[PDB]
Amino acid sequence: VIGDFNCTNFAINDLNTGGGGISEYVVDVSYGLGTYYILDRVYLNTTILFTGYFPKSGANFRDLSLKGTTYLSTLWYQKPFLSDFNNGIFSRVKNTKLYVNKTLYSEFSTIVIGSVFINNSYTIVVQPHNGVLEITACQYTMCEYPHTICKSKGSSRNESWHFDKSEPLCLFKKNFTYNVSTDWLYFHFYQERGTFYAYYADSGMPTTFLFSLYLGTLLSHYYVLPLTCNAISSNTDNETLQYWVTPLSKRQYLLKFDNRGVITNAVD
Ligand SMILES: *[C@@H]1O[C@H](CO)[C@@H](O[C@@H]2O[C@H](CO)[C@@H](O[C@@H]3O[C@H](CO[C@H]4O[C@H](CO)[C@@H](O)[C@H](O)[C@@H]4O)[C@@H](O)[C@H](O[C@H]4O[C@H](CO)[C@@H](O)[C@H](O)[C@@H]4O)[C@@H]3O)[C@H](O)[C@H]2NC(C)=O)[C@H](O)[C@H]1NC(C)=O
Ligand SMILES: CC(=O)N[C@H]1[C@H]([C@H](O)[C@H](O)COC(C)=O)O[C@@](O[C@H](CO)[C@@H](O)[C@@H]2O[C@@](O)(C(=O)O)C[C@H](O)[C@H]2NC(C)=O)(C(=O)O)C[C@@H]1O
Ligand SMILES: *[C@@H]1O[C@H](CO)[C@@H](O[C@@H]2O[C@H](CO)[C@@H](O[C@@H]3O[C@H](CO)[C@@H](O)[C@H](O)[C@@H]3O)[C@H](O)[C@H]2NC(C)=O)[C@H](O)[C@H]1NC(C)=O
Ligand SMILES: *[C@@H]1O[C@H](CO)[C@@H](O[C@@H]2O[C@H](CO)[C@@H](O)[C@H](O)[C@H]2NC(C)=O)[C@H](O)[C@H]1NC(C)=O
Ligand SMILES: *[C@@H]1O[C@H](CO)[C@@H](O[C@@H]2O[C@H](CO)[C@@H](O)[C@H](O)[C@H]2NC(C)=O)[C@H](O)[C@H]1NC(C)=O
Ligand SMILES: *[C@@H]1O[C@H](CO)[C@@H](O[C@@H]2O[C@H](CO)[C@@H](O)[C@H](O)[C@H]2NC(C)=O)[C@H](O)[C@H]1NC(C)=O
Ligand SMILES: *[C@@H]1O[C@H](CO)[C@@H](O)[C@H](O)[C@H]1NC(C)=O
Ligand SMILES: *[C@@H]1O[C@H](CO)[C@@H](O)[C@H](O)[C@H]1NC(C)=O
Incomplete structure (x- = not known):
């Protein structure tokens, strides 16, 4: 389980x-x-x-x-x-x-x-x-089995990943825009000295800084939420989700910058 709040028992199996x-x-x-x-x-x-x-x-x-x-x-x-x-x-x-x-x-x-x-x-x-990329950091009452929905095409179940009836305490809450037309987004999420840091790019590959956030506590887990949809499958549209992740570490890279300041190449 992710959190421990029993948000629902509808259509769960093993x-x-x-x-x-x-x-x-x-x-x-x-x-x-x-x-x-x-x-x-x-x-x-x-x-x-x-x-x-x-x-x-x-x-x-x-x-x-x-x-x-x-x-x-x-x-x-x-x-x-x-x-x-x-x-x-x-x-x-x-x-x-x-x-x-x-x-x-x-x-x-x-x-x-x-x-x-x-x-x-x-x-x-x-x-x-x-x-709109909504980003928050709050004392959420996370569900046992959190997930999201296709708000566009609809879903056979309602959205639930937290159950707070009144707004929880938040250290952070912001919105950032992203270009809905691009094929890929890239993110770095990392922590140093009890501060979380986020970089993204919606265009090109090298990411740029969004925000940083003092937590004062070591983060230790992450999870990519399931998404439920009546679309996104081979019997209906041949579309797919993909969310590729890999660990970060403190490393030395060669970076090459072109004559307009874009990072074009790198070596580990
Ligand atoms: C922070 O996060 C914690 C979890 O980590 C939350 O704690 C839980 O809070 C809920 C809601 O108060 C507790 O709910 C339990 O509901 C059981 C009945 O559920 C059904 O029926 C109700 C209507 O009566 C529906 O709303 C519900 O959807 C279900 O259909 C009760 O039986 C539970 O009672 C417990 O105590 C009695 C003794 O008094 C025992 O006899 C029972 O067997 C049982 O142990 C209870 O009311 C849930 O239990 C809480 N969990 C924990 C671990 O504490 C916090 O609420 C949340 N904080 C904030 C501010 O949101
Ligand atoms: C993580 C994962 O494995 N994800 C795949 C998913 C699950 O394995 C399955 O959900 C698990 O189920 C459990 C846990 O019980 O299967 C999908 O494929 C299905 C066939 O496997 C799909 O064709 C569905 O077929 C139906 O017969 C049916 O109900 O499964 C009718 C339904 O309308 C139709 N869905 C549509 C229209 O999107 C899907 O989507 O659900 C492709 C997903 O990539
Ligand atoms: C950041 O972006 C999110 C997502 O767009 C914004 O959240 C959305 O805000 C609107 C306006 O408050 C909400 O609409 C209202 O919803 C209630 C409940 O259904 C309804 O009674 C009102 O009449 C109105 O429609 C909307 O529900 C909410 N969530 C979503 C998923 O759209 C948010 O406001 C933005 N700003 C910040 C600072 O977070
Ligand atoms: C988790 O919550 C669900 C309700 O969302 C619980 O399911 C109910 O359990 C009682 C037990 O007496 C039944 O009478 C109801 O018919 C059940 N369904 C509903 C819709 O209330 C479930 O028992 C909870 N606990 C677990 C471990 O799943
Ligand atoms: C949003 O993303 C799309 C897709 O990457 C961008 O469209 C490209 O724009 C350049 C000029 O800037 C054209 O040369 C390409 O041919 C366009 N590609 C396609 C598939 O149309 C678009 O410019 C981006 N807009 C913003 C505001 O970021
Ligand atoms: C960017 O750096 C490259 C590499 O030093 C420069 O390319 C050289 O340019 C001179 C003429 O100024 C040529 O004689 C060399 O043969 C080029 N070398 C290579 C490897 O191509 C380039 O001029 C620089 N451009 C800018 C705008 O700074
Ligand atoms: C979804 O929400 C509506 C409105 O509260 C409710 O009637 C319906 O039963 C819910 N369905 C599920 C599967 O949660
Ligand atoms: C999905 O792709 C396969 C392979 O081309 C094809 O057989 C199938 O009919 C396609 N279905 C849809 C809904 O496009």
């Missing part, structure tokens, strides 16, 4: 849907994937050695996205999906572009980051709402 296991893909930073822009600095037409929170090159990404329809498997709310946060993670996220009456809509998995997922501790949550 089926091992991952008969083929967690899907994997290989980290390759040679085109600037996994890198981020350094503070407020600009470098031009040059190569820098820099030490930062980066992926290991030639490590695996894991796809932790989980599309459901009606039933939720209890096995989705355990290891290997519930994952140790350590120093941090890098995410490569497919923007699942759907259509209704030729209008475009953007969906992708919510991620939660925390320690015990109980309302006496802060949980960070990052959730898309069709071009």
